[PDB]
Amino acid sequence: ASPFRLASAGEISEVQGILRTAGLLGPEKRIAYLGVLDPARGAGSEAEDRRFRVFIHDVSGARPQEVTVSVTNGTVISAVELDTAATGELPVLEEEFEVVEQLLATDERWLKALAARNLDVSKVRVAPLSAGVFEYAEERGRRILRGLAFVQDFPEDSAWAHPVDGLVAYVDVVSKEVTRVIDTGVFPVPAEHGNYTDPELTGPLRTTQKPISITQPEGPSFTVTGGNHIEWEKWSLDVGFDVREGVVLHNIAFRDGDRLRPIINRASIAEMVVPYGDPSPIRSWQNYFDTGEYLVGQYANSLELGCDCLGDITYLSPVISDAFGNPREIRNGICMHEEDWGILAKHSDLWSGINYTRRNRRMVISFFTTIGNYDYGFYWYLYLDGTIEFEAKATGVVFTSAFPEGGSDNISQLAPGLGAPFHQHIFSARLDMAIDGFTNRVEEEDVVRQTMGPGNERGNAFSRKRTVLTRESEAVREADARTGRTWIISNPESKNRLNEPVGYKLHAHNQPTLLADPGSSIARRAAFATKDLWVTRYADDERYPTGDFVNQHSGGAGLPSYIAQDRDIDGQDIVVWHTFGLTHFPRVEDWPIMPVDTVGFKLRPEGFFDRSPVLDVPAN
């Protein structure tokens, strides 16, 4: 019934049938992206029309197409031919990754480079990576992947321990041509293995860890209805899944007495970029747009009970399309559970004699994705007190290189001869806000220091200032941790019982933003990552901070083009885009497999409620 329900296998099969009947999905076509469109703005609107957006690639080299289909009515709504040299290439296909290593194994330049290093081609793995846009004019309008080589000594060996530095190749994956092979010189291949399940490396396993048992004897406190609608401790929301963005939260609302009060209409991680900071020509092109180029939902893991998710777990198993339009289920791809979260509130009062303690808990919605060497966990948390938090967990195996003799300013040493280039992991959260409805505004709040003098004779006073962002051209903001800067999203037409506008406050971690030179290719393609906060007026087609087609696309799309419209955002339907990330100088302890590091953000009520919203929590 719900328009926000997960896509079903039948819906995906029906999209395939509709495309086939329309003549759009013959044997030379491949589906590079397929996802459900959210309902347009309008309460009720069209009753039931589930629409899907499809990007269709052609392996014969014909122009690709963007197609919108109505699965309800069995019709193609629109189909447009794309000029990829202008608007960008489609996302990378899983089947294109395998092509790179195979093509290189028969290229005379590649074989000659490996022979110079006394390497057996049968043992050389090639990491196929997105190409970006640089100085190679022949790449415009072609689908290019770039390949970096690693040696696998035996089938269970971690190839990441054995990078083949000084060598890179570029491959046209449609015409199946190796365009360039670049060899800047022989580096020793690091010889130490990185096999973290080898007892020679682990030593004997610990026998000291006693079990921790987390159980819910009466079951969990949340309910799931309609497949993906959650009700938990006054919160209400729908859990969506999109092959590009991964988990998407819809319709986040809080039940305050008799009233269901909206907070966030749609929350997602709408892009994530991983730029590398090594100026070697072997790697200076390396920038992953995991969301926009690779599609993080496509690579979601099946999560194992007791290992990945511990406790009383409820799973969702989202369905995506494969490259031919057949449904593929990601079994146990989303874990949901509640967690104890320590003390919520506590006070022992001398004068009244009352001692009061209450415990907190949070609802957790998570998934994990694996892109090559890296593994990322995406965690959304809802707390009893109205706080919403996102946390990204980064782990996996660091990307490696040789460590140059004499050292490096841009690479860490992990093991003898083994380096790890400096890089960042930067996320963009897209928060389509709906604080008590859609009439919202953003205020920047700074601490204000005051000078000792008249009206402040003891020099103790301090204050704060709020500045309303009224137009998009002034809504590109930077962090300032030293002034305690936060941003408040409020509804100027909905007041609390003190006659102040209701609001939520965004607390950032204030980590560095994109470090690359502003003139670089990556700064132009990932312009969102250069500033901490952007606010736009809502528009149906403004979905991603990097635009629709990120692969091999120059600048020109995404947030800088949206904000040029300079739209009114003072008490309007607005979207907050928050950039946050980790700057990774790898340490020895990250090798041979990296312990989790985290980054995120949170939103806390700011006069949204008329008093604490957790006065009705029982004592247990």
Q: Quick one: DSSP state of residue 551? A: B
33 in a known ligand binding site: no
> By the 8 A CB rule, do 52 and 69 touch?
yes
Q: x/- site string to a second copy, residues 499 to 518, per CB under 8 A?
A: -x---------xxx--xxx-
Q: Considering only residues 147, 333, 377, 545, which one is a binding residue for a second copy as defined by CB under 8 A? A: 377
Distances (CA, A) of 193 to 124, 125, 204, 417, 588: 15, 15, 18, 12, 15
| Contact by Cβ (8 Å): 193, 153 | yes
Quick note: the x/- pattern for a second copy over 586-605, rule CB under 8 A, is -xxxxxxxxxx-------xx
Query: Of 38, 242, 278, 290, which is the active-site residue?
Result: 290
- Binds a second copy (CB under 8 A): choice among 19, 159, 171, 334: 159
Q: Counting contacts by CB under 8 A, is residue 554 touching a second copy?
A: no
Residues 560, 566, 571: CA angle, nearest 5 degrees:
120
CA–CA gap between residue 403 and residue 71 (Å, rounded): 54
In the complex, what is the shortest distance from the CB of residue 502 to Cu ion, in angstroms, rounded to a whole number?
Answer: 22
Single out the residue of 26, 74, 226, 416 in contact with a second copy (rule: CB under 8 A): 416
Residue number with CB closer to a second copy (7 or 124): 124
Write out the binding residues for a second copy, residues 319-358 only, by CB under 8 A.
338-340, 342-354, 356-357
- Contact set for a second copy, span 220-239 (CB under 8 A): 220-221, 233
Q: What distance in Å separates the CA atoms of residue 68 and residue 59, rounded to the nearest whole number?
A: 21
Our CA angle for 159, 419, 194, nearest 5°, is 35
Minimum CB distance to Cu ion, residue 394 (Å): 6
> Minimum CB separation from a second copy for residue 606, in Å?
5
Count of other CB atoms within 10 angstroms of residue 233: 17
**CB of 113 vs a second copy, minimal distance in Å:** 20
Q: Which is nearer to a second copy, 172 or 391 (CB)?
A: 391
Closest CA to 477 of 534, 438, 523: 534
Ligand-binding annotation for 423, yes or no, is yes
Residue closer to a second copy by CB (options 183, 391) is 391
432 binds, among Na ion, Cu ion, a second copy, none (CB under 5 to 8 A by kind): Na ion
Q: Which does 584 bind (CB under 5 to 8 A by kind): Cu ion, Na ion, a second copy, none?
A: Cu ion
Q: Is 541 in the site for a second copy (CB under 8 A)?
A: no
- Find the radius of gyration of the CA atoms of the chain: 26
| DSSP secondary structure code for residue 403 in this structure | P
Active site residue 374: yes
Q: Quick check: 149 binds a second copy (CB under 8 A)? A: no
Closest CA to 580 of 387, 414, 429, 446: 429
* Residue 3 touches which member of Cu ion, Na ion, a second copy, none, C-beta under 5-8 Å by kind: none
Residue 347 known to bind ligand:
no
Count of residues engaged in binding a second copy, rule: CB under 8 A = 148
Residue 314 contacts a second copy per CB under 8 A: no
DSSP 61-113: SPPPEEEEEETTTTEEEEEEE--HHHH-BPPPPHHHHHHHHHHHTT-HHHHHH
Residue whose C-alpha is closest to residue 171's, from 268, 106, 263, 220: 106
Q: Which is nearer to Na ion, 93 or 433 (CB)?
A: 433
Of 584, 599, 606, 608, the one binding Cu ion by CB under 5 A: 584
Locate 360 and state its tokens: 């907190």
Residue 254 binds a second copy (CB under 8 A): no
Closest approach of Cβ 2 to a second copy, in Å?
22
291 is in an annotated binding site: yes
Per the structure block, which two tokens stand in for 494? 């909905």
By the rule CB under 5 A, 29 interacts with Cu ion: no
Residue 458 binds to a second copy (criterion: CB under 8 A): yes
The pair of three-digit structure tokens given for residue 155, joined into one six-digit string:
């089938």
The yes or no reply on residue 283 touching Cu ion (CB under 5 A) is no
CA dihedral 213, 219, 220, 221 (to 10 degrees): -130
Question: Cβ contacts of residue 249 below 8 Å, gap of 6+?
Answer: 237, 238, 239, 240, 264, 266, 267, 268, 365, 380
Assign 292 to helix, strand or coil.
Answer: helix
567 is an interface residue for Cu ion by CB under 5 A: no
- CB of 576: closest distance to Na ion in angstroms? 9
Rank residues 96 and 472 by Cβ distance to a second copy and give the closer one.
Answer: 96
Burial class (CB in 10 A: 0-12, 13-18, 19+), 464: exposed
Which of the residues 170, 276, 374, 562 is marked catalytic? Answer: 374
Bond from prior residue into 592 cis (ω within 30 degrees of 0): yes
Task: Please report, as ranges, the residues that interact with Na ion according to CB under 5 A.
Answer: 432-433, 538, 573
Query: Minimal distance in Å, beta carbon 48 to a second copy?
Result: 31
Q: CB of 244: closest distance to Cu ion in angstroms?
A: 22
Tally the residues of the chain. Answer: 620
Candidates 38, 165, 245, 375; binder of a second copy (CB under 8 A) is 375
Among 179, 439, 520, 572, binds a second copy (CB under 8 A): 520
Cα separation, 23 vs 127, in Å, equals 35
Q: Does 494 bind a second copy (CB under 8 A)?
A: no
**383 known member of a binding site:** no
State which residue, 324 or 356, has the beta carbon closest to a second copy.
356
Provide the CB-side half-sphere exposure for 292 (13 A, CA).
31
Q: How far is the CB of 264 from Na ion (least distance, A)?
A: 9
**Ramachandran quadrant class, 325 (left: phi over 0; alpha: psi -120 to 50; beta: rest):** left
Q: Contact region for a second copy (CB under 8 A) — 49-57, 448-456, 537-545, 550-558?
A: 448-456
Candidate residues 490, 521, 546, 551; the one interacting with a second copy per rule CB under 8 A = 521
Quick one: residue 215, left, alpha or beta (phi over 0 = left, psi -120 to 50 = alpha)? Answer: beta
Binding residues for substrate: 288-299, 371-376
Kindly list the catalytic residues. 290, 374
Annotated binding-site ranges for Cu cation:
423, 425, 584
Residues engaged in binding Cu ion (CB under 5 A): 584
